[PDB]
Structure formats: structure tokens, C-alpha cells
């Protein structure tokens, strides 16, 4: 079982992602909110991906399903098939 793993997304990783976006200063409360946003986004993508796997009578999530699912969320991905 896995319990309280979202904290594995470290604070320097969020710092690096913000630096990529051009952010100069970062408040201390940003990290928990960012973790929550990432959890919401991942849940939304994973729900559709697991539904696509369940319909095909498969037991493994493939890359194509994840592409199809993000494209269904308006987040089309190039480079992993389609």
C-alpha cells in the first residue's frame, strides 16, 4: 500500500519548474497548493486513461491511452504515438 506520497514531489523541483516559467520570487505557501493542483490534474488524466484500459479488457495502461486521454482533455501530446 502507498500512503502520503505526494510529498515526494520535492520543494527544489517546484523551484526548478517555477524558474523555467520565469518566476523570480516564491512564497512558502506555493508548494502545498502546487501539490494539490498536480494531484487534481493527475487524477483527471488517470480516470480517463483507466476507463480506456478497462473497456479494452486490458490489464496494463499503454502510452496510446494516455495520449488519447490528454487529447480528450485538450492537452494533445506529440512524440508518443497517435
Amino acid at each position: 500500500v502507498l500512503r502520503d506520497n505526494i510529498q515526494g514531489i520535492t520543494k527544489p523541483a517546484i523551484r526548478r519548474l517555477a524558474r523555467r516559467g520565469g518566476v523570480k520570487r516564491i512564497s512558502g505557501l506555493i508548494y502545498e497548493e502546487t501539490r494539490g493542483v498536480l494531484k487534481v490534474f493527475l487524477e483527471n488524466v488517470i480516470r480517463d486513461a483507466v476507463t480506456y484500459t478497462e473497456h479494452a479488457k486490458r490489464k496494463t495502461v499503454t502510452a496510446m491511452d494516455v495520449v488519447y486521454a490528454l487529447k480528450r482533455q485538450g492537452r494533445t501530446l506529440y512524440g508518443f504515438g497517435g
Binding site: V1, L2, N5, I6, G8, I9, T10, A13, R15, R16, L17, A18, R19, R20, G21, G22, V23, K24, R25, I26, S27, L29, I30, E33, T34, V37, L38, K39, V40, F41, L42, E43, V45, I46, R47, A49, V50, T53, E54, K59, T60, V61, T62, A63, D65, V66, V67, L70, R75, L77, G79, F80
Partner: protein, 91 residues
């Protein structure tokens, strides 16, 4: 302040992923576990999820930086996060 611009210059020219692979893998498996058990995952699916989540977070931080710039501040705050998400249409 100087090293902030140095970090911006270094990371905006680089292309490798900034989220560490193993914690993200465990996070994906932990989230997927509560929808269905004994789920397997292709490595390419985990990589696609990592790339998409990183792109989304980079875009969100850019829009949040614009919101922070608007309020005559240089530090981003959580109220900028929910402002960008609200205007962008997420709930």
C-alpha cells in the same frame, strides 16, 4: 536576486525533465491504485504523464507570474494560483 536570473537562464535553455522520476512513478501508481487494483503501467505511459504534467505546471507558473506582475509584486502567492485557474476555467 542574481542567481534567480541565472536559474531562469539555465532552465529555460535546458530540455531534460525537472521532476524526479521515481517519486512521480510512485505518485502515479498511488493515484491509479484507488480506481482499480493490480494495475500495470508501461514505461512510456509514465513518461508521457511526466512530460504532460511538467508542461502544464510550466504554463500555470507563467500565467501566475503574469498575475503577480499585475499586482505590482514580484513574489507569486497562492491567490495568483487560484486566480489563474479560475480564469482559465478549472474548478
Amino acid at each position: 536576486g542574481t542567481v534567480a536570473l541565472r536559474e531562469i537562464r539555465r532552465y529555460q535553455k535546458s530540455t531534460e525533465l525537472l521532476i524526479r522520476k521515481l517519486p512521480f512513478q510512485r505518485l502515479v501508481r498511488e493515484i491509479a491504485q484507488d480506481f482499480k487494483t493490480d494495475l500495470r503501467f508501461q514505461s512510456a505511459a509514465i513518461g508521457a504523464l511526466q512530460e504532460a504534467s511538467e508542461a502544464y505546471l510550466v504554463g500555470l507558473f507563467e500565467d501566475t507570474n503574469l498575475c503577480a506582475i499585475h499586482a505590482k509584486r514580484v513574489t507569486i502567492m497562492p491567490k495568483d494560483i487560484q486566480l489563474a485557474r479560475r480564469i482559465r476555467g478549472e474548478r
